[PDB]
Structure 1
């Protein structure tokens, strides 16, 4: 599923991301924009052999099992394919574990490089929430 901006903002708010660990909803929308272009089916291979999955590009090195990432963890206790669903529940719940892991949203290099220190409120401007 390719979400609209405000549709994704509403779905993330309902699933409890707004101000989760102090990160305003605009931070999560901005991260999703630059990670996946709001596409739940997005996948990308990493140099280490792991793969990033879904709307927030969650990694098989630590967070999910994709059956092909050797010497990895599955800390969200899910198949990586769950992160590609039109239903973002698994990606949200797994993102809450990731953002709680010590580095906050710096876990998403796209957030650090494209969203941190910017006017992220712009990502939810105009949305009915």
Structure 2
């Protein structure tokens, strides 16, 4: 599923991400834009052999199981395929664990490089929330 911008903001808010660990909703929408262009089926292979999955491009090195990432962990206790669903619940629940791991949203390199220090509120401007 490819979400619309306000549609995803509303879904993220419904699942408790607005101001989760202090990160306003626009931070999460911005991150999803640049990680996946709002596409739940996005996948991308990393040079270390791990793969990133879903609207927030969650990595199999640490967070999900895909059966082909040697030596990895599955700390969200989910198959990576669950992160590709049109229902964002699994992605949101795993994102809450990631953002609580110590480094906040800097866990997403694209958030640090393209959202951090910008007007992230623009990503929810105009949306009915």
Q: Give the TM bin, normalised by the shorter chain.
A: over 0.9
* Shift of residue 2, structure 1, vs aligned partner: 0.0
Unaligned regions of 5+ residues in structure 1, if any? none
* Shift of residue 86, structure 1, vs aligned partner: 0.1
* Shift of residue 102, structure 1, vs aligned partner: 0.2
- For the residue of structure 2 that corresponds to 1:94, the secondary structure is helix
Aligned partners of 1:66 and 1:123: how far apart in 2?
Answer: 31
Q: String of CA shifts for 1:58-112, please: whole Å, max 9, x gaps.
A: 0000000001000000000000000000000000000000000000000000000
Aligned partners of 2:101 and 2:62: how far apart in 1?
Answer: 11
Q: String of CA shifts for 1:8-45, please: whole Å, max 9, x gaps.
A: 00000000000000000000000000000000000000
- What TM-score, normalized by structure 2, do the two folds share? 1.00
- For the residue of structure 2 that corresponds to 1:52, the secondary structure is strand
CA RMSD of aligned residues (A): 0.2
Question: Partner of 1:83 in structure 2?
Answer: 83
Q: Write the mapping of 1:1-129 to structure 2, written as runs, cut at 5 A.
A: 1-129=1-129
- For the residue of structure 2 that corresponds to 1:110, the secondary structure is helix
Aligned partners of 1:81 and 1:70: how far apart in 2?
Answer: 17
- What TM-score, normalized by structure 1, do the two folds share? 1.00
- For the residue of structure 1 that corresponds to 2:44, the secondary structure is strand
- For the residue of structure 1 that corresponds to 2:68, the secondary structure is coil
Aligned partners of 1:50 and 1:65: how far apart in 2?
Answer: 10
- For the residue of structure 1 that corresponds to 2:83, the secondary structure is helix
